[PDB]
Design a protein around this ligand. Structure first.
Ligand SMILES: CSc1ccc(Br)cc1CC(=O)N1C[C@@H](C(N)=O)CC[C@H]1C
Ligand SMILES: [Zn+2]
Length: 139
């Protein structure tokens, strides 16, 4: 679990969106595993607008932050699950690091701000949905 709170927006993993997120829907994309909903209160977070490939992410299954080297946003194959058919997820960045299913929503940050959120993983791998290209989040 976890979300990004910026301005009057809440950014969450689309597969973890609540009834309230869908009732206050701004934008959603199954191919990116992202959903953005509107809020009444002003958010706490700021978004990075950079090309950083190193950062730090929060891992809930270890209650710890870890440093990572991550790949550029790209189209990566993701196995079928209860949430989605087998498909290519776009704007996904991979890194070597620990992750379990419940880790989705953990924030990845660089020196400039929020980069994205945990969205996939495997045996010693962790994948993040990029949000740096969503310029409308703060303007
Ligand atoms: C941090 S997630 C994770 C980590 C380790 C291991 Br094994 C497995 C996962 C779970 C995972 O990759 N997905 C894919 C995700 C998606 N974006 O399609 C939807 C939830 C779930 C099925
Ligand atoms: Zn950066």
């Amino acid at each position: 679990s976890g979300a990004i709170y910026v301005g009057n927006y809440r950014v969450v993993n689309r597969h973890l969106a609540t009834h309230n997120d869908w009732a206050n829907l701004v934008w959603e994309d199954s191919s990116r595993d992202l959903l953005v909903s509107s809020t009444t209160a002003q958010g706490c977070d700021t978004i990075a607008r950079c090309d950083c490939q190193t950062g730090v992410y929060y891992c809930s299954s270890r209650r710890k932050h870890y440093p990572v080297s991550f790949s550029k946003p790209s189209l990566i194959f993701v196995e079928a699950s209860e949430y989605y058919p087998a498909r290519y997820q776009s704007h996904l960045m991979l890194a070597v690091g620990h992750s379990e299913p419940g880790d989705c929503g953990g924030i990845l940050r660089c020196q400039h701000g929020v980069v994205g959120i945990v969205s996939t993983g495997g045996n010693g791998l962790v994948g993040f949905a990029d949000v740096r290209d969503l310029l409308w989040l703060d303007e």
